[PDB]
Design a protein around this ligand. Structure first.
Ligand SMILES: N[C@@H](Cc1c[nH]c[nH+]1)C(=O)O
Ligand SMILES: N[C@@H](Cc1c[nH]c[nH+]1)C(=O)O
Ligand code: NI
Length: 496
């Protein structure tokens, strides 16, 4: 069967695990050693056995026999070792952490050596795609790659489409669709093509998940993708390396941040903006094992927000705005244009924070424009993944100002300690208790009970429209990024 999908952003700069697995359409053409389960354990497509040592410093990987690539070339230990070592030394992103080396014992066994225990290396094992040691070249791979994925590339028209076909050498199960065509369209054009019957699967914003489309069915997919506001946690007066202002004199007050957290009604955000297709999120890891269980509050509480503001010395002035030492609680919320739900979320927040006396300005821009103001102003972001490293990216002092990570320049030495403890655990199960202390350790934290570096809002569920004859099956909770639906691609069925 042939299926046409418009599910997200267009892939830019190639299909090479070596250059970066950032896009997320690699799930189509590639396959890592491990695949994550719904209980956050790990299974494997390519391995019969994978055992880390008790020290957590080394991994032993036994490959399944008779594995092949999309071109029919054999998949063995040489290719795994080549993959990991080359991605390690390439220096082009690809976080390998404490990785040292991959040694080939026999055609079916690889031994991975790490500098120190790393609880997140299991995420590397579950992300980095395997390339062919012989056939890999940085020039010809990006355009026409070979992998262990369920599909192999056939055609690619930039700005137009991308055509792939089922890989006969796939080690996993086959679905009911032998050919897939992915069209690159904006959300509205995609919806139009869905209603016209041109496409079988289309991704739509939750706002549009309303009413009935002919010969189509809505699919709500569980997701850890989120929406939240990041606060500048330091006073103003400093600039970064690129001359962008850092800090906000209003939001540097922790009371402001806690009050904003308590005044917001997350359930109303879900029901009124996301059409019920979100769940309230009080953290960046909402619903995950490493989420602090006590990190939730009873929000939409105006009187408590007012009480918090009054306790810190924020009083209404003659103009009806909170003032403290002549400084009014006037803030500007920034967000990225080109997204309707973000505009609506920002507006809704502006309306939600008014009754507690906080005046919210709105400013939308391109990411290039947002980059300049995201350190000096509260900003809308979306994140979320099955990788606990998010907590690091958000709350590590070393991540402050780096790319889009930690724009509020949050620095708490104890939180850094807990993060480092989590990283240095041999297993992720042992790391989980340390990840939770990031929120609150009983003394300090980055959560609401703590410094409240964020006003986290929602975990957004992904919405699709599929033909009535198409079953999208199930998979792990989808994440922030594009082409997340692909995580379920093996389970796809044709019911007509
Ligand atoms: N991932 C973050 C930041 C970002 C910048 N560019 C792409 N993403 C967001 O979507 O809000
Ligand atoms: N690759 C982008 C995806 C994105 C589009 N818009 C926002 N985010 C990211 O990780 O943030
Ligand atoms: Ni993003």
């Amino acid at each position: 069967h042939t299926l046409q999908l418009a599910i997200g952003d267009e892939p830019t700069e190639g299909f090479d695990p070596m250059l970066g697995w950032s896009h997320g359409s690699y799930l189509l053409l590639h396959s890592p050693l491990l695949k994550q389960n719904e209980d956050f354990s790990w299974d494997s497509l390519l391995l019969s056995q994978y055992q880390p040592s008790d020290d957590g410093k080394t991994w032993l990987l036994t490959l399944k026999p008779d594995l092949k690539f999309s071109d029919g070339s054999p998949l063995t230990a040489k290719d795994v070792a080549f993959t990991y070592n080359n991605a390690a030394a390439s220096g082009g992103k690809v976080d390998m952490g404490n990785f040292l080396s991959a040694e080939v014992i026999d055609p079916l066994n690889v031994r991975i050596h790490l500098k120190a225990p790393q609880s997140t290396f299991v995420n590397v094992l579950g992300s980095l795609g395997i390339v062919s040691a012989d056939k890999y070249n940085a020039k010809t791979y990006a355009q026409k790659p070979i992998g262990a994925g369920p599909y192999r590339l056939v055609s690619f028209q930039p700005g137009q489409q991308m055509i792939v076909e089922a890989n006969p050498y796939y080690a996993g199960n086959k679905n009911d669709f032998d050919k897939l065509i992915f069209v690159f369209l904006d959300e509205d054009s995609a919806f139009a093509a869905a209603q016209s019957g041109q496409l079988g699967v289309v991704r739509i914003p939750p706002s549009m998940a309303v009413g009935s489309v002919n010969n189509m069915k809505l699919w709500v997919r569980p997701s850890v993708e989120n929406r939240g506001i990041v606060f500048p946690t330091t006073p103003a007066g400093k600039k970064d390396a690129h001359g962008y202002p850092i800090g906000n004199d209003v939001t540097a007050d922790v009371a402001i941040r806690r009050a904003i957290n308590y005044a917001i009604n997350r359930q109303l955000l879900a029901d009124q903006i996301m059409e019920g297709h979100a769940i309230p999120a009080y953290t960046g890891v909402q619903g995950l094992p490493w989420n602090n269980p006590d990190s939730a509050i009873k929000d939409g509480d105006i009187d408590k927000a007012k009480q918090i503001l009054e306790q810190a010395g924020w009083q209404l002035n003659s103009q009806g705005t909170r003032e403290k030492n002549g400084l009014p609680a006037k803030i500007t919320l920034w967000y990225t244009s080109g997204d309707t739900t973000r505009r609506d979320l920002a507006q809704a927040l502006r309306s939600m924070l008014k009754p507690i006396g906080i005046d919210v300005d709105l400013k939308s821009g391109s990411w290039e424009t947002v980059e300049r103001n995201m350190h000096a102003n509260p900003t809308l972001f979306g994140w979320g993944s099955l990788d606990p490293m998010e907590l690091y990216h958000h709350y590590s002092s070393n991540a402050a100002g780096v790319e889009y990570y930690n724009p509020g320049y949050y620095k708490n030495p104890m939180v850094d300690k807990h993060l480092q403890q989590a990283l240095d655990a041999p297993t992720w199960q042992q790391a989980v208790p340390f990840w939770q202390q990031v929120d609150w350790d009983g003394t300090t934290g980055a959560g609401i009970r703590g410094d409240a570096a964020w006003a986290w809002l929602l975990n957004i569920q992904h919405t699709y429209l599929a033909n009535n004859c198409v079953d999208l099956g199930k998979g792990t909770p989808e994440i922030h990024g594009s082409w997340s639906l692909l995580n379920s691609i093996d389970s796809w069925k044709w019911t007509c």
